[PDB]
Amino acid sequence: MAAAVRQDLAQLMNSSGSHKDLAGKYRQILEKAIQLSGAEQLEALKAFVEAMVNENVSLVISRQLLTDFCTHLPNLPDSTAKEIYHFTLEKIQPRVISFEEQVASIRQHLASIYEKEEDWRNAAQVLVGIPLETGQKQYNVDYKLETYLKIARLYLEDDDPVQAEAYINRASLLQNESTNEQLQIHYKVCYARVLDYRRKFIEAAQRYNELSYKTIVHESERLEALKHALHCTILASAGQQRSRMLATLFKDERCQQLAAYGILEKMYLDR
């Protein structure tokens, strides 16, 4: 019955009236389309998306109905809904300069879905597409920081340094603007992970040691960060900085808790 939905949308596009009545009728049509299933529901939602991006439909009507559509979709499982996500992302280009909140939400949802299916490469590609720099929505610093952090974390398991290095660069650029302490802790953890990954085992050990003496971080997470610091220090280039880091790490008792306690004991006590 997708043809009937498309015909109703086409007839309502040429209808004249108040914004509230048209919005209500379109919302009812969208709800009817959602009640469908399978290819019929897919085609009905595709027609709804095509109508929303159409020039004739009002700006407020289009943006609000796309928002409601994007809110209803996560209820439908990880399926052809992803195909219509791609279709809608490609569709938004004549009005991609007016509203981007819907585009950002679609990109975030698609990145989450790709992360669910062990796909960091495609999630990274999708989430890169966000226009954070523009400022035409003027996203708050926290949202841009979270987006760049998510891209950097995705790229770490997709194994592609160049772009994640630049993304960490930009996340640091906008980092000294944000407020949230937990977000800052997560950013520092991700930055230490990046340092550990590239070649910066000594700098990663320094960052992990700095993060180890924290309170809000979970005791298990604190122990994991300290273990990462210890392993980076062992794997670091053996020099004065590594010797100082080994001496510093020979003080924590939760270092003694770890299984590599003996290892750095051998390292620092000389053998």
Partner 1 sequence: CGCQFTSKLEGMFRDMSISNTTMDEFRQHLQATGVSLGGVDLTVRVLTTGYWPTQSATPKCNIPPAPRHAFEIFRRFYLAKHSGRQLTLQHHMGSADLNATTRKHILQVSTFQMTILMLFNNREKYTFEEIQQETDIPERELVRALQSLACGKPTQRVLTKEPKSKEIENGHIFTVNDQFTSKLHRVKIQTVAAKQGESDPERKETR
Partner 2 sequence: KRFEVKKWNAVALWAWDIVVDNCAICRNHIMDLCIECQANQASATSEECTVAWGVCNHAFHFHCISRWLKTRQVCPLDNREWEFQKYGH
Return the ∠ at Cα 212 (arms to 207 and 214), rounded to 5°. 115
Which of partner 1, partner 2, none is residue 173 near (CB under 5 to 8 Å by kind)? partner 2
Could you tell me the smallest distance in angstroms from the CB atom of residue 72 to partner 2?
Answer: 35
Q: How far is the CB of 165 from partner 2 (least distance, A)?
A: 5
The token pair that represents 63 in the structure block? 């943006």
Residue of 51, 110, 116, 113 whose CA lies nearest to 85: 110
Whether the Cβ atoms of residue 227 and residue 260 lie closer than 8 Å to each other: yes
How many residues bind partner 1 (CB under 8 A)? The answer is: 12
Q: Which stretch binds partner 1 (CB under 8 A): 2-10, 52-60, 142-150, 192-200?
A: 52-60
Q: Is 136 in the site for partner 1 (CB under 8 A)?
A: yes
CB atoms within 10 A of CB 139: 21
- Residue 259 interacts with partner 2 (CB under 8 A): yes or no: no
Q: Rounded to the nearest whole angstrom, what is the least distance from the CB of residue 124 to partner 1 in the complex?
A: 21
How distant, in Å, are the alpha carbons of 19, 42, 164, 167, 177 from that of 133?
33, 33, 16, 12, 14
Least distance (Å) between residue 60 CB and partner 1: 6
Q: Which of residues 89-128 bind partner 1 (CB under 8 A)?
A: 93-94, 97-98
Q: How far apart are CA 69 and CA 34, in angstroms?
A: 9
| Residue 257 partner contact from partner 1, partner 2, none using kind-dependent CB cut-offs of 5 to 8 Å | none
- 173 is a contact residue toward partner 2 (CB under 8 A): yes
Q: Take residue 175 and report the two structure tokens written for it.
A: 């980092």
Cα 55–chain centre separation: 31
| Residue 162 binding partner 2, by CB under 8 A | yes
Task: Quickly count helices (H) and strands (E) in the chain.
Answer: 15, 0
**Using CA atoms, how far apart are residues 161 and 203, in angstroms rounded to an integer?**
17
Find the part of the chain contacting partner 1 (CB under 8 A) among 42-50, 51-59, 117-125, 211-219.
51-59
Q: For binding to partner 2 (CB under 8 A), which residues are involved? A: 162, 165-166, 169, 172-173, 241
Residues that bind partner 1 (CB under 8 A): 55-56, 58-60, 93-94, 97-98, 134-136
